[PDB]
Amino acid sequence: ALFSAQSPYINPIIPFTGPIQGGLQEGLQVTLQGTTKSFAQRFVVNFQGNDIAFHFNPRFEEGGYVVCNTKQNGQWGPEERKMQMPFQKGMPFELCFLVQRSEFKVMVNKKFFVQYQHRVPYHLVDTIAVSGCLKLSFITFQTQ
């Protein structure tokens, strides 16, 4: 049973940048409903001026895969690549990030896709940022 603390962002214009009230919290669920463009190459979801705690980057290249990473001081860390594309060009998607004690859990269309353990603490993240070849219907914030 999930309750919303923060009001959702409805039909945000891509590229979008918006604050997460009170910052990330344990148990917080961030759901993105939207659509992948028909000729999509890439899109980006960043939890983060220039320091990305968690970089979520699907790529319609080399068979289809998703990059998870962290930017610290303008430097990308080692990549954790999941060699499978859970999205589809032209098709709507549900993307769910769950903030757990030691990892983000990532769900795509109600099925687990990947986890990424925190390299920097989640508490210091107070900004979601979305860009690339997609449109969004909404972004929700829910904490049980």
Add this chain to the structure above:
Amino acid sequence: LFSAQSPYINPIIPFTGPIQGGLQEGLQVTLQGTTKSFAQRFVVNFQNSFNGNDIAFHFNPRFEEGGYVVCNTKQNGQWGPEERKMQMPFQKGMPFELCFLVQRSEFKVMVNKKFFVQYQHRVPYHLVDTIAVSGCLKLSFITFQTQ
């Protein structure tokens, strides 16, 4: 840290050997060895001999394309989606300490005393009673410690 199994000393690669009482929560499997200096890739397979062919955890460092490690599972002769760590913690031609710490929800992998990668269980871990090692390396020993 106690020996639930007596160490394999200088096992010849390719290697295949039983793990005593299968994988358990808190078990550390250490591979002390050296990577060849002309090394393409090498394999550490944790597997179940009751479906031989299958591989529960496939750990495969590849000295290619900048150097990365592949972690995967093989079920019914099929490979699942790969989890690639894009970083090579083994130096070509050099010695290494490779630790596999079995935990409730994942394998924890340590290289040269540094945490390297994790791998969440895709098939139940209790099924693994075999460790297999192959490719461009040589092994000094394989120890077994319980945490």
